[PDB]
Design a protein that fits this description.
It is found in: Cytoplasm. By secondary structure, this protein is of the alpha+beta class. The chain has one helix at about 25-35, and strands spanning about 10, 20. Bound molecules: zinc ion. Zinc ion binds near residues 13 and 29.
Length: about 40
């Protein structure tokens, strides 16, 4: 059940393409990208 929202996310993660209504919410997210574990390499 996901519906009904107000406002937009002027911020988006260039790494994957995520969104964040806040500027700090994104910065903290970009972290997960910078350095991580997993065979997903390229
Ligand atoms: Zn991302």
């Amino acid at each position: 059940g996901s519906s009904g929202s107000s406002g937009e996310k002027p911020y988006e993660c260039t790494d994957c393409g995520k969104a964040f209504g806040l500027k700090s919410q994104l910065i903290i997210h970009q972290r997960t990208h910078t350095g991580e574990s997993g065979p997903s390499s390229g």
